Amino acid sequence: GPVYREYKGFRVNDNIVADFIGVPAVITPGETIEFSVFYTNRGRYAYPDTGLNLVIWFSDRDDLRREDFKLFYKVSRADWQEQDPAKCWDPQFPAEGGVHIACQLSGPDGGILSKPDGTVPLPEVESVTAHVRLAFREGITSEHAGIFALPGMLDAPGDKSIIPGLFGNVFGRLQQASFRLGEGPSSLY
Amino acid sequence: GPVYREYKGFRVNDNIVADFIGVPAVITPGETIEFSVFYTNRGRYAYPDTGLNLVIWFSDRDDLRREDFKLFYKVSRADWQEQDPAKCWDPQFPAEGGVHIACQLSGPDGGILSKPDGTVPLPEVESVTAHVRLAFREGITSEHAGIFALPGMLDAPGDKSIIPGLFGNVFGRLQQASFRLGEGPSSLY
Amino acid sequence: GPVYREYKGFRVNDNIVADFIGVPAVITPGETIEFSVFYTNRGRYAYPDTGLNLVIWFSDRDDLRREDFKLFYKVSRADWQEQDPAKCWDPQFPAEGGVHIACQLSGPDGGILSKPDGTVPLPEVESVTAHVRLAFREGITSEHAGIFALPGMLDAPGDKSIIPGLFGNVFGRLQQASFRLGEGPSSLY
Ligand SMILES: C[As](C)(=O)[O-]
Ligand SMILES: [Cl-]
């Protein structure tokens, strides 16, 4: 069994990391972007079932909700699907301000790692990708926002997910992508 | 106290890492790009005050100076500001050629981690972001350049910065973004 | 001497890592992109000779070959060159489908780390970059593809590369960039 750390009330294994590709540092309100994100087993313990969670957070306003953006994704080689608003955590409000909306992006990966019983085990060195399509509705903006990739794992076969709407009873290392939702930079020269 | 390694006579804690988002691999001279960069406490020691440093480096020429580019930044949810040329290191000249221009991008983060006395403590798992607007003047080019993100920390409360013009008496893990400054690639097909 | 783990019968040192800059999450068939990728020594053991390997992989088809894309690269401040198809591994076919084409992108870096004898030693904290130009021929597509950065090292000076066509008898930590080859996302709103 692997070593867990505690963060808030949850168990975190830093050996399950996540990487982003193609997140722009500025997103235009109303426009659709596609990026990729994948979590990888940098440890020696094979997890029996895994799935990605994504957290969308605005630091400078607290009114953003799941319905304020459109979110589609595809697990590795499987087909695209719309992210399910019922597979989300309720909005969380940090003590310093803002709001984050955590979304579950789990499911079979097209027969690369996934098994007939539906699990997506993560042997060492292996990875699972979500290709993600994201768009924020027009008229909403943020000057310091981010996406966090939160890998979710089931520690033992037949474990239950611990956060309502998210995948996993233990979690991997949070990965960040900071951006602004608004207008691009004016010329400095 | 955390474990430091010595590198070029400075104290480095590899548990304070940095990530880049949105850096292009080719930058057009004269054009403004915006990217984000953030440092994260991946260790268990909470630093009492922290700030980011950025190094702009050209490997194939040594004539670049701070005056050859315009640089603005914004710490997390604080306001945009112009980077201060007096809050920069003197040009450094590696033995193999080229020049590094080390720039301090510190300050309050808009009250997320920062405190009324101006300090930015970095608890574990926490991060601080700089949104960065950058443009190199027209007529300057480089075929192998990069930005290095150098997190700076004050190890104990009331410590003084050790590199004149930069923030910190100890430093985090150097993170790199390599790019060309010049023209994009012609179509290979 | 460093600690190796075994992976598919090869020796891997996770302290030699790789990072990507500017890989887009969607690449258009026929269009040329340029990105950079660099491997960094995050350990304390200096390797006497190093070189990057790049793997192009399609998960959803197995007919892709080295001839189906154009690949040029440049080691740090050395000159651009075309990747040599004879310095490639034979196509590898995972049992679950798809194909991987592993390509050697080694050589001197313009005298930054490289020495007159042609070797590229990698001291601690140091790094080697490849600027990469990549284009897939028109009419070929993939819904889940990626680039893997496989650092190659020689553990000892008189060691020989262990995979025909790739650099190294030991290898670093695999780094991934997942993308689709095809059309960008249509508007969700
Ligand atoms: C209540 As609303 C403006 O977040 O859809
Ligand atoms: Cl956009």
Author numbering:
A (entry chain C), B (entry chain A), C (entry chain B): 9 to 197
Copy text verbatim from the article accompanying this structure deposition.
In this work, we report the identification and characterization of a small enzyme AvmM that can catalyze the construction of a 16-membered macrocyclic ring in the biosynthesis of alchivemycin A. We show through in vivo gene deletion, in vitro biochemical assay and isotope labelling experiments that AvmM catalyzes tandem dehydration and Michael-type addition to generate the core scaffold of 1. Consistent with the apparent molecular weight (66.2 kDa) determined by the gel-filtration analysis, AvmM was characterized as a homotrimer, with each monomer adopting a jelly roll fold. The overall monomeric structure comprises of eight main β-strands arranged in two parallel four-stranded sheets, and three small β sheets. Using the DALI search program, AvmM shares low structural similarities to some components of large proteins, all of which adopted a jelly roll fold. Additionally, AvmM has a long C-terminal loop, which interacts with adjacent monomers to stabilize its quaternary structure.
Consequently, the structure of AvmM was determined by SAD phasing using a Se-Met derivative crystal, and the resolution was extended to 2.09 Å resolution in a native crystal. The overall structure of AvmM-2 complex is highly similar to the AvmM apo-form with a r.m.s.d. value of 0.18 Å for 574 Cα atoms. Furthermore, analyzing the B-factor of AvmM structures indicated that the loop1 and loop2 in chain A are highly flexible, and clear deviations of Y15, K16 in loop1 and E104, H108 in loop2 were observed by comparing chains A between the apo and complex structures. Reviewing the apo crystal structure of AvmM and MD snapshot of AvmM-3 complex, we observed that the C25 carbonyl group in 3 forms a proton relay mainly with H152 and Q184 in chain A and S135 and E134 in chain B of AvmM, as well as the amide of 3 with Y15 through hydrogen bonds.
